[PDB]
Amino acid sequence: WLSAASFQETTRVLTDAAINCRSDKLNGLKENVIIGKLIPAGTGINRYR
Amino acid sequence: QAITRAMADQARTIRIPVHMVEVINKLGRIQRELLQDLGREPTPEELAKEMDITPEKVLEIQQYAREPISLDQTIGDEGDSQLGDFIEDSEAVVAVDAVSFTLLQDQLQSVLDTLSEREAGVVRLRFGLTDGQPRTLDEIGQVYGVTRERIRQIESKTMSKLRHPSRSQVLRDYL
Amino acid sequence: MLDVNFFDELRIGLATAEDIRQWSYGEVKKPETINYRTLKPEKDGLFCEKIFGPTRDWECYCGKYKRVRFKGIICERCGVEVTRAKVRRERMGHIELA
Amino acid sequence: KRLKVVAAFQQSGNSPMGMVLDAVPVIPPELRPMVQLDGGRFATSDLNDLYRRVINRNNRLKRLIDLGAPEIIVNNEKRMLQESVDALFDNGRRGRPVTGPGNRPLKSLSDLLKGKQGRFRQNLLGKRVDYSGRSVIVVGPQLKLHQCGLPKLMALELFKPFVMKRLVDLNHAQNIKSAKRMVERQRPQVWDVLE
Amino acid sequence: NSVPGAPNRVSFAKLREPLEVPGLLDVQTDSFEWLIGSPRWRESAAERGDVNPVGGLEEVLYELSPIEDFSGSMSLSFSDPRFDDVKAPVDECKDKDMTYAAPLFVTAEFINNNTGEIKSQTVFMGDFPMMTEKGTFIINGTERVVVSQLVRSPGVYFDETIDKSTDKTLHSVKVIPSRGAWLEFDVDKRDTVGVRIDRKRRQPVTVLLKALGWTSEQIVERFGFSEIMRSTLEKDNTVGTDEALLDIYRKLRPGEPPTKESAQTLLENLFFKEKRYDLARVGRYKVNKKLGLHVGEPITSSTLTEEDVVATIEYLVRLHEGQTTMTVPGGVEVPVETDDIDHFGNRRLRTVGELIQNQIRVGMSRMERVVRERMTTQDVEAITPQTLINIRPVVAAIKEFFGTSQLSQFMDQNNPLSGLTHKRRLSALGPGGLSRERAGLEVRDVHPSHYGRMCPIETPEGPNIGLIGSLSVYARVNPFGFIETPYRKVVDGVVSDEIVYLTADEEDRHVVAQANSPIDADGRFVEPRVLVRRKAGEVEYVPSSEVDYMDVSPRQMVSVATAMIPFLEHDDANRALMGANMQRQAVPLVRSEAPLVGTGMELRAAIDAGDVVVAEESGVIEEVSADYITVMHDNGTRRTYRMRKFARSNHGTCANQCPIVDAGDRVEAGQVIADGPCTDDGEMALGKNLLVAIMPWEGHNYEDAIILSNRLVEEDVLTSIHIEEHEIDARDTKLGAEEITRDIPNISDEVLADLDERGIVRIGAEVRDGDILVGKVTPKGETELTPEERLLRAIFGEKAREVRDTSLKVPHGESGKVIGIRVFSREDEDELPAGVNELVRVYVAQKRKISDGDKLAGRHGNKGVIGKILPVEDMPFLADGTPVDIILNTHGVPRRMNIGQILETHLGWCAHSGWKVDAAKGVPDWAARLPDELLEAQPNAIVSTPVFDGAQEAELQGLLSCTLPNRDGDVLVDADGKAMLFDGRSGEPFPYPVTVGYMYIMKLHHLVDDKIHARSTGPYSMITQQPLGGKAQFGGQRFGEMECWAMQAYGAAYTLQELLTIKSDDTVGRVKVYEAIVKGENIPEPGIPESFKVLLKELQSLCLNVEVLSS
């Protein structure tokens, strides 16, 4: 839900995000970007890390 | 009456008592009438007469008449930025001070330790730097078992030998 | 909630009254922000120092404790916890509805 | 349709009580700062204003109820409380936006999140960075592929701490602060060391 | 010519002018005159519509009078809108930051209608701002410009659309009055009418006509043949005049109980009352012409009536029925033609006068509100005109208009053009205007109805392409404000000198012809088939005697700045836009060479700009001086002219006005007294005239990079003075007051060297970046004295120095000499606001000798920053041994349809060397219709070329034949055009001849001294710890999402974590990295940042619990 809500219709999608207790994986690319965590690409995967 | 009190004491972003807003409204009335009554904006040196109050009070009244503004209103000709975008957090760490504050605190150890350790400890509590309480010389007598006048003597023994530029040359860069 | 950046799963969900009043550090009941003379938050004003914590760093409403040596102490007159001014960013409040 | 919600709540440990509200959060005041400009002039975020309206609404609703009033006025006040909370969560959803001074709409929580101005697309997806700069460009034919020209002053104020230290341990400035003033005054020594 | 001081600028003109070029300030002048009651306007209005010579002032006064009370026993009425003399002259108000203005007065009439009393009280209205001769209003001293606006002339605009279900063509109408609520009549997907009033879709015309007091009778007397409405009256499903009234009420005033009269009178109060639905006066006239209702009558009753709407409904239906002439029963006929908008016949022009009188209308609307408020609560006979009138709403209304209303914007001033052409601007945006996102594609287009009215080329190239417009040259302002353009009219093949002003709708019943035809001067066209414009704007061939209108003359459809580009007809309309817009951005140099090749409008366009001092009255020049010039009039008195030197421009430049006159020469009414920043001999001169060779020089003029002759830099031929002011404002405080003296805390010696004791620099102090300019020393405040500094003040012996020096240091990248100081003070007993005891304006100038990165540009859009400038050593030379002025890249020319600047290049070569087209035995074939005295020219000469009627290609071919040199025997450009060059580096010849000739160039206001910003770490945002934006504030650079995309596409995760974490938002790490590279150590592991945590606070603050599980 975080990725989509960070894409479009910020409120509308956030509604059902709240309804559906959708725990975000905190693993997605754009997720990592927002949360300040290293992204899972290029030099960010644990193999290279 | 209810509307008056409610507006006076609840319609202000910053609530102001009835008396102060009352004089403020009286000003907005008498000055605004005096503008027409004068062919000109009535001057404050004149407006202070009609209320029979000193001009400084009039200006305080006026400076409380001005209201807070909104931080998000557009400022650009088109809508692309808000006012809040130009505001600085006063509580920002210069981050040169912080590193330089550590350097101050460390030059402090390097200078105190190069001085005698009795004196270093004396000042560490006299100014109460490592603690929260600077001390007087009769508290030091217990911790250091000597007469307070002897710490009066030691304070100068610290400062004057410090007042040799050798300590001062390396510390005067810290300002 | 301590957030040392060791994060695995971000959860979003509705909040109940027992959550909102659980997060708050009191209930705000007076629509005031600033003292036009003292330029301070009022008792349970919208910026109430007691509720959201102190502004003056390690200095309570009456400044009963103006030194970091007192840290965390809640003043016995105002109750403003003696701590960092960062909490006014960290803490939050609530209003109860009639 | 109604399935997608009723089942979602059935499975989830979520009570549709929360979809109606009786307590409201209050965002930390600094995030809605009541800040003073240089010389007394202040500035609010207008969220404090919405809180003011809701607070006064609830306060007068209590005053009526604590006293006990004719019903219809209480019905009006209750609707007003509905409206004020509506604005607080979402200005301009039902009916007109709640415009404030000089006929402009205000800002609500739901606004802080939307579009190229909401946090997502304005302050988390893209943000402003230190140790940076900008200048016009010119052709760099005398360069090689990896090489890029650089306005020396721009490089200085980019590489400020680096040059600070480097001449500090060359003692051209005793401590870092002396070096900061050195660079500020732009003494010759800062330039070779910049190289 | 036709100018008392112009030099001979010979041209190739083909025809003569039935009228000369108008005063180019006639956009603000006439508007404001009509606003006032000017004697000029008094006579002009009493002769061109004298049914009502009435300025916005008198007009609004009458629409407002007489205010009554709720009952009608007591009333107030107005008269005599009277003015007074201004409060101080132009510079004086600007000097001491005052709004140039004059007082206003009015004579009231306190009429107690009950019994009768009068008070003809001459009520002071305030100090109404006034207009300067240049049309520029001074606000608080600041100069501001009120731009003209385009708007929709109110009324009914019938439209057509498709249903895309049965592909039926449906018709509707927008009933559009100024200050009106919507009422929408249409024919729906079905054949019924949608009569949705104020956006509420039910109740077709049965609720509409019956509610007027009607039943189906009068309706069917009109709708038996109107099948679109026969079903409506057949789908009535209800009966009653008051029934239809309540149906309106049920659909226009629902939510509140009805009653048999509430709607019955409401439907009168809505459109048949004049307090909620009032299309403008010119709107009433526009409809009078549209439907033909009124054909000989003056305008009144902006409140809607009944006759109009029946004609409206029948026009809509007979359009849905596809008729050709709807004639509402009882008047003249009109044709069935859809109501366009973008055709200027419906787009009026709200000028300054309309805007100001409307703001005054609303101001006195609220003033009437207050009059009634104090007419009741105050006792009867205890009330006087003064007490009834609150003039605050009046003065507020204007000031809130003037201040912070984008129709009253800053006056832009970095050159005389940006002063002038900023006026005569026809904007599309604003109140009543359409916002950019709402401003769709079509409206941006160049409508055929722009010919002669709006400049079709000079438009902004930003997001306002096509929105913001500029006047033409010959245009006119209508009393109504509809655009008017003068044209000749060909009657029976007699193109008359008659200067007939028309607007767009005055063409659709006419035909405008070709502008340059083989007209024999008999008024006929030689060829029958002439390229004319037909009524619909169609441009085709029509016989000679059939078209009815011919244009006035060339350069009529063009603006002024566009009229300074020789060979516009050889230049791409695209690039022409760039050149015109850049001509507004030139910087004030110190010579302002006139173009050897320009246009005849420059001489006219400069004096009209006011930036050229003129001899307003003839008589002898008494004396010439750099500070003044006295023109001794032939009659006793003289005229002393006090000049304006080093007066900073609105964009930080000079307004230098140099004299070009003689101590005794007779000066005429309309002749120069001083050239301005970018003028010479009274014609615009923004740059210099330079020989060319567009050979690409070793990849330093590559891709819009430019290389110049360094002589021009050492000569400073292209160099600009840059004035600037730093404002230093010391105010009243509880700390005290910021005493500006040379009492500096902790100041060295070399830094006071060029400073005077009184708290500023020495006036004429050479200063630099960071240089302390003004010591605005303040008290510091409270703080814990660090023990180290305590020991220091105990060890070496310096003072606490508890004063916060908030002095001015020249911020990044500024320098130059100091001009002086403009200081106002409270002890000076001035009008400083409540607290500011010292207002200081220190002025620093620098003549920025050019450098790479500074934007230059020609007159044909060719532009760019200087890549490099080497000394004259490696400059190829002609067969005259001459290194050339300017070297450019060729590759921009082929791909940009811009050989036009080369055309001017070569003709300027001819104009610099002179020529003698040999009429040895007969005028040469080109030379024959090539006008006279163009066969003659001597070196170092000046000429012009009209945009469309200029020096044709063949003519120029004839200008190459005799290529008589300047000094040596050297004909370098052959008859066909090219020349030969020898490299100045090699001394070795190029394989092919090299081009040369004379180009006009100028310096643009986009300096690399202005557009650099650097930051290691400055301050940070309020809410987030993020940096701020701006070059003024130390600010910080923005890294957007669209950068994040490529940023990950590189796979460089760690750098992105750097960007968003510590390079933006981690405090402690920011200090850590400071610790890292103050310890000379590699920058260690990234921290976790604040705005991310501020992100969390934002999110947690959202009435939704959120906790990220570690596990």
Ligand SMILES: [Zn+2]
């Ligand atoms: Zn306390």
